[PDB]
Amino acid sequence: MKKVVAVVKLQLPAGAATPAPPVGPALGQHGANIMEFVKAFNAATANMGDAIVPVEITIYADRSFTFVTKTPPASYLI
């Protein structure tokens, strides 16, 4: 059972995830692999230029995680 322990909501500049805050403390709090997220997020958003990327990180009870990125916020593109 993929039991969820947290849903972390961030907004990061595309390709600009780092192990510093916010990602460091946010994922670190729940024991999730910070660098795996950084690498995966940056790869997934690599062709998005300077867009602001909302991302939701779902962290499971065994420290594994998945994430989903959303469409740039209304304000931005508005």
């Binding site: 192990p19 024991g31 909302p54 009870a61 420290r63 594994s64 916020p73």
Partner: protein, 254 residues
């Protein structure tokens, strides 16, 4: 680094967020009742938030420090950076984006149950393989494993984990149906929820040779009766039950 703390949610503070980014914000984090906006330095802002200096902590070294080997005798589940000096069989699993890091009761119950029942040379089905940890353990015990998962995103992760461990289980996308042409099996291990086991029980019978074993976990203690009922209806004989915290593993003979 500095943080600018604002009352509200990201959705609620949406209209002012581009102004935080224009001012040099490196990222936003929604916390309980607040948004935390991180900056290299503070700036004159019109929004009535609160500035705090937060230093520069090594979050990566902290993460590695607090993640410890997960013991599940006869196995120990290790991250790639861990050392181990005991007689335990090591399983190296990258904590990543697939369930099965070894840091859950259910994964551990299943590893112990594999040790009790897996005869050298036997064919093993790991149904819902996730990180590949159970299939990899099966190989370490001399079993010939097939790991299957409905989630295609986990399978490259399971492959990478097998390579870290110098073993060669087969991995496939799909569920029980997809596995059937590769069996029947001598042993089935399945870390799944109670209602899915109950639905699959007749098919579990089909997947196993007489004298085979089914090792079912992922079952909350209070949902165990449903699985006992299902496996009885499908002709299995009960072997042991094991528990850790609120979780149970139920073993059956085919």
């Amino acid at each position: 680094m500095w943080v600018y703390r604002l009352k509200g949610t990201l959705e609620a503070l949406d209209p002012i967020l581009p102004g935080l980014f224009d001012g040099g914000a490196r990222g936003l984090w929604e916390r309980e009742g607040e948004v935390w906006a991180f900056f290299p330095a503070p700036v004159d802002l019109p929004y009535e938030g609160v500035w705090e200096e937060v230093g520069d902590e090594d979050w990566l070294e902290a993460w590695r420090r607090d993640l410890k080997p997960a013991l599940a005798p006869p196995f120990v589940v290790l991250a790639p950076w861990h050392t181990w000096e005991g007689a335990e069989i090591p399983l190296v699993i990258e904590p990543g984006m697939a369930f099965g890091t070894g840091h859950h009761e259910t994964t551990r119950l299943a590893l112990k149950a594999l040790a009790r029942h897996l005869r050298p040379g036997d064919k093993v089905l790991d149904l819902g393989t996730g990180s590949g940890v159970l299939a990899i353990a099966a190989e370490k015990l001399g079993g010939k494993a097939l790991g299957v998962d409905i989630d295609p995103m986990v399978l490259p992760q399971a492959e990478a984990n097998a390579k870290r461990n110098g073993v060669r289980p087969r991995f496939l996308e799909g569920s029980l149906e997809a596995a059937l042409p590769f069996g029947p099996f001598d042993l089935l291990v399945a870390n799944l929820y109670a209602e899915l086991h109950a639905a699959l029980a007749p098919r579990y019978r089909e997947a196993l040779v007489p004298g085979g074993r089914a090792l079912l976990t992922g079952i909350l203690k209070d949902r165990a009766p449903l699985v006992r009922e299902a496996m009885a209806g499908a002709g299995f004989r009960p072997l042991e039950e094991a528990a850790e915290g609120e979780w149970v593993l139920l073993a059956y003979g085919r």
